[PDB]
Ligand binder design. Sequence first.
Ligand SMILES: Cc1cn([C@H]2C[C@H](O)[C@@H](COP(=O)(O)OP(=O)(O)OP(=O)(O)O)O2)c(=O)[nH]c1=O
Ligand SMILES: [Ca+2]
Ligand SMILES: [Ca+2]
Ligand SMILES: [Ca+2]
Ligand SMILES: [Ca+2]
Ligand SMILES: [Ca+2]
Ligand SMILES: [Ca+2]
Length: 903
Amino acid sequence: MKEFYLTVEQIGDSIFERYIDSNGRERTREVEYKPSLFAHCPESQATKYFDIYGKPCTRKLFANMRDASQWIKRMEDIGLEALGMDDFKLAYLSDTYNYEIKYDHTKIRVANFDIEVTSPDGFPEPSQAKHPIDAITHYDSIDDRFYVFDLLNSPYGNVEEWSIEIAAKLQEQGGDEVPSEIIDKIIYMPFDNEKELLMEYLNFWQQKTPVILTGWNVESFAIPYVYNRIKNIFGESTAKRLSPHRKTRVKVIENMYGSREIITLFGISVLDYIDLYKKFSFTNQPSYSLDYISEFELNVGKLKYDGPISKLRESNHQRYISYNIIAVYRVLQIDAKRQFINLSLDMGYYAKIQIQSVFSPIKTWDAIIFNSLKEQNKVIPQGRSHPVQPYPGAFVKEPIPNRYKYVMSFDLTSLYPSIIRQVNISPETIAGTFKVAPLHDYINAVAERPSDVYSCSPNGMMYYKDRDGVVPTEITKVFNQRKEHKGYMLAAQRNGEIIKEALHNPNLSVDEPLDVDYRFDFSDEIKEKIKKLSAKSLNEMLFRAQRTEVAGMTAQINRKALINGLAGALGNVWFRYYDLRNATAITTFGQMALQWIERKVNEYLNEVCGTEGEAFVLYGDTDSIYVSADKIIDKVGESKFRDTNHWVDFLDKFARERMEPAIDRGFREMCEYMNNKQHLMFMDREAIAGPPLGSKGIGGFWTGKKRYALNVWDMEGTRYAEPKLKIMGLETQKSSTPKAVQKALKECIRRMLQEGEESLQEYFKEFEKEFRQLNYISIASVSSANNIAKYDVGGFPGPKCPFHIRGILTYNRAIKGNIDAPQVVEGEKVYVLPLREGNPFGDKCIAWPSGTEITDLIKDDVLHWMDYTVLLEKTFIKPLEGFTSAAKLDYEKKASLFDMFDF
DNA sequence: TCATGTAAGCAGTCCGCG
DNA sequence: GCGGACTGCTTAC
Ligand SMILES: Cc1cn([C@H]2C[C@H](O)[C@@H](COP(=O)(O)OP(=O)(O)OP(=O)(O)O)O2)c(=O)[nH]c1=O
Ligand SMILES: [Ca+2]
Ligand SMILES: [Ca+2]
Ligand SMILES: [Ca+2]
Ligand SMILES: [Ca+2]
Ligand SMILES: [Ca+2]
Ligand SMILES: [Ca+2]
């Protein structure tokens, strides 16, 4: 088998590499790497090396990496460019693996762990680590085993061994419901004292050294806690045994409320699952506790225990250990669904970077582009410093706020990367400039053609049409992978709807789910078999279809994110290929493309409908247009339709057969106008939206830019079993809106769009009447809490203190002297509740850590003093007033002359 | 919230306002 | 008690 790296580090003049050899064995080697850099030389001098602009360079081969670094400093002082890859471990990986890496994940040791630490005096700070580690569960992907280290004797209590038999039992029978499928995989190890637990854990770590180290919050808690605890007991040299190269870097973030550390373990790639999740999931959660995220992702219940966690080990050691094990497993279950570790490995090896560098699109692209250029014997430019400079982005149309009955939307495929490819935008493809007209003149095709020789953007830039740019070339590769995976995702999505339709008429039989690949549209024969399946089998199939969809979603959306990352990297000062001419060539072209096609669509629909000057395009943002389809429906006549699906079919065909070809002709003209290298402006139909036929539903509405709601019947070719709300920007979409209010507002919207005003009024009246009965957490607002210190003047609010920060200060004063009260953490999210006048907290609101119950000592007072009137007004009524005034509807029946009668 | 980019909405503070 | 200038936060793309 072909070899592949696991980890790489630079330590002085040495590269330390862990890798898999040709026999599939894990090996480590220290290499005195001899790096090369480059300097421009005279044209007369023969060389195989050229910079990206075709200028000759000489290779400087250095005896060591320090020599190479010192040369860079001297060149800077002389004032000459020092070219080539200055991150030597990237150069090393490129030299060592000069081929497309095929990796075997079964050889890569992926470790997932979490620790428990009983603390009778508040949160156990990793930087201090003054309390015993009393449990560790460490799952090893190669052994497929959960290694459980259990401390039986501690200054905070001596306890009996944990029971696997009791652990497996149902919670309703006094057990802990440790899942049956991992019971056989647990290796339990009790210890009579902390020192032997920790020594054994280190010995174990040596035998089974993680390559990828993950878990929930491991970077900020478990790793620095373990490191500092070992350091305190045994000394730092023993702590450094956590690094296969015995090298660590400790970085301390000082703060007004307490300092914390992050530990770099040389020779390990730490991918904290919370960071993976935040980067790759495309959610914004109100809380990032594992309980909340597990509930969100897996629909499993909160891990219930009585009393504080500081007393759980002593009162119920049995459950304490089971919960530690289950928490480790939950992360594994989320990853089985989401597949972020797989993605990280895919991306890391593709780029030839340290796996942890997947978090940085700038590092990722620098490596991809370096490897690409190196193949052609080309030499990369030196990284330069630039001042931060704002620059223009996309265009967003101002919509007329209103209800909109029938809407069809259209969207450009992968816009920014497509612009890069179409225009041929790269550092080395720049051909010159042309004198710009106002953008409006290009949009309306009155400006003179920019060039009949080069490929142009309306920002004034011209590019070579005949040479391949490294940026377009490498962006195309990832785009094509993105396209493949999005195909698999949409197929699984369509397949899911086939199963949902078949669930309306399940069969009374004992059968099994069909063995099929959900990444491909079901054949006619499979669809026939599905129509005869039982509910049990259909439900299992739907689960499998949805899991396939989620895997496709992970794969496509993050490759989309990577290529989009390159377009913005051009406008980031730390990017080697930073250049506002290119960043701006992209965004400006986008602005033109959107407004050009709005004109073309308005022109086309007026023509086919036999009118002039009517505005069909009602809205657009960046690369999308929203087309009012009312006149289309009216041209044929509503009564001509049998049911909802008939008019949806009609509009789907109208868009594909009439509109899309006109859209294509429009963009082909624009491509000729700009003399671009390749036509890649592909704008396909996205949503078909409207009210159910024969209903009083309004179909959709806009309140403003980035704020709208649509009742969607078909999305990108997925014909839904049941209509689906597409809501953008409104409070239902914001993580700061209370959970129960999101729900109530969404149903208000559903009623407006599908049923009409009277239905809305009925629901509003009910919610208003019942809302005081909702659980306090469900009606609490949420906010991130940044710069808490700045506004903290002797426990009271300073000037311009934000509302949520005021709530934290109110909380801090309320929990003073209470050692068991959870502290609010800087930068994390809080629940927020307004308080009534005269409350014992002495202020207008309170805030506490999100995803938790407020501490029992002040909970009673919070419930008593909650200002429901204010909560309803601010979070529910005011947003709803926004939706309904825009929609020209009322949520309350208003007074009229009819009130004089007894109805 | 350690990690490409800009556009742009709403909540809230402070200030003005016979 | 509402509007403008300002920060903070969050979402759409
Ligand atoms: C969603 C998103 C878009 N953008 C930019 C780049 C996109 O090309 C542009 C349009 O956004 P989108 O239309 O959402 O995405 P896309 O055109 O790149 O991909 P597709 O429509 O095929 O799914 O806005 C970002 O920079 N960051 C983002 O998170
Ligand atoms: Ca725990
Ligand atoms: Ca798009
Ligand atoms: Ca059936
Ligand atoms: Ca879009
Ligand atoms: Ca599309
Ligand atoms: Ca109390």
